């Protein structure tokens, strides 16, 4: 069939011809790689599919139209917008209540695509009342394999309803959705768990108010349990959610720590996947930016030597996150905690990173060195620390920084050199 034949059949008074034409259009959209989406939109068929969605007298044409609209809305933002401007959203929301499960689930998938296009269409799908019918579909006892696949479809759509920012999802909708996400987190299906963790991670990515919404439900312990998963598809979103949560207040970070997340981070800080490593090191840096009891928990879990290893031998992005972890540690830590950090061998890797080309990183490293020196002063071992820094080659790097183009670097390194490395002894 051609688009011309489809157009001729769809404007026919015979329902069977309309159905065959809709089947041909759906087959173009579902079976052809690089489908003719733009030609189909230019043919003006979107209003026709939206109209067929309401033909309860013929469920097949409903199914075919919902499928065609799904594949149209699965492309660019303008194609999804063509779907939205044709009036597809309310028709699909109403089709959610179709007695035939496959039709309702095709409507779920279509709405998921539309909402995944962006925050505007997401808020539109929410505004036309999709959440209640979707949750009604998600309250049914799913005990079959077909029910499992439909649950995957529904969870994916829900996660797209939790996604994107500027604006963030309306708070009323997020609170309407959260209980279902908490329930879904207790399923055994890996895809359902992954999609649910992704929804959680979306909801936690923002100001501390959204983190508080997620945390009050009580999911953090189960999020940590999933963080300990051997499935990367489940661990990755769970780690993103935990990381977002520890960017918040001290009490939210403490919720995460009491859930036992740190006990998983050894494995995460040496993970083969460099993205997982960088994410875990960033999370650790936000944890070491916390209270002294939280730094003490980082110490109790034996994570400091691991962080030294990462700072020493990891890729530069993970080394940058490790630099932030170290500087936050030495900014908020006790003298004993900073001494412990020194005994684990932080000086040489931290200092070797002063050859990096990132000026901000160099300033952060110099700030960490100053914190370490101030702890030493409190102990009266500033001289021993000076000798340590000199013997690992650190004095060379600080002196070289006194010739840096950036004046902040120059002033910082000069301050350190004038304060601890410009000593004069006149002994009798």
């Amino acid at each position: 069939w051609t688009v011309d034949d489809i157009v001729k059949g769809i404007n026919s008074n015979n329902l069977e011809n309309q159905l065959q034409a809709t089947q041909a259009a759906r087959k173009l959209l579902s079976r052809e790689k690089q489908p003719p989406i733009d030609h189909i939109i230019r043919a003006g068929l979107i209003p026709k599919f939206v109209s067929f969605l309401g033909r309860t007298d013929c469920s097949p044409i409903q199914f075919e139209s919902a499928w065609a609209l799904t594949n149209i809305a699965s492309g660019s933002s303008e194609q999804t917008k063509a779907v939205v401007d044709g009036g597809a959203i309310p028709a699909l929301i109403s089709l959610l209540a179709s007695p035939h499960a496959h039709i309702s689930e095709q409507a779920v998938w279509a709405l998921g695509n539309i909402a995944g296009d962006g925050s505007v269409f997401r808020d539109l799908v929410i505004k036309y009342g999709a959440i209640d019918p979707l949750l009604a579909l998600l309250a049914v006892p799913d005990m079959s394999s077909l029910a499992g696949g439909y649950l995957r479809n529904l969870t994916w759509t829900l996660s797209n309803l939790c996604r994107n920012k500027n604006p963030a999802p309306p708070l009323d909708a997020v609170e309407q959705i959260l209980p279902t996400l908490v329930r879904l987190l207790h399923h055994n299906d890996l895809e359902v768990l992954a999609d649910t963790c992704w929804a959680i991670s979306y909801l936690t990515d923002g100001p501390n108010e959204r983190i508080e919404m997620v945390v009050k439900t009580g999911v953090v312990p189960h999020l940590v349990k999933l963080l300990g998963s051997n499935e990367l598809s489940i661990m990755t979103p769970a780690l993103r959610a935990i990381g977002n949560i520890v960017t918040g207040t001290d009490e939210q970070t403490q919720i995460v720590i009491d859930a036992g997340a740190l006990a998983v981070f050894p494995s995460l800080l040496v993970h083969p996947k460099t993205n997982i490593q960088k994410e875990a090191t960033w999370t650790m840096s936000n944890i070491t930016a916390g209270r002294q009891d939280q730094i003490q928990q980082v110490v109790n879990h034996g994570l400091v030597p691991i962080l030294v290893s990462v700072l020493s031998k990891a890729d530069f992005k993970t080394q940058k996150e490790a630099v932030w972890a170290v500087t936050n540690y030495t900014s908020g830590g006790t003298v004993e905690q900073i001494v412990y950090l020194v005994h684990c061998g932080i000086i040489e890797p931290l200092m070797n990173l002063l050859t990096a080309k990132d000026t901000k990183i160099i300033l952060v490293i110099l700030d960490a060195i100053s914190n370490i020196f101030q702890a030493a002063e409190k102990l009266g071992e500033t001289e021993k620390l000076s000798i340590m820094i000199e013997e690992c080659g650190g004095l060379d790097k600080i002196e070289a920084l006194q010739n840096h183009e950036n004046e902040s670097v120059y002033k910082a390194s000069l301050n350190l050199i004038e304060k601890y490395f410009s000593v004069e002894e006149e002994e009798d």
């Binding site: 579902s30 499928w67 998938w109 695509n113 994916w156 520890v246």
Partner: peptide, 22 residues
Amino acid sequence: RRKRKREWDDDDDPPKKRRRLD
């Protein structure tokens, strides 16, 4: 010092749209 919020990226952020094929 400071908590550092997440920076915009898509390391493995899920797919936004899916096409149904047969």
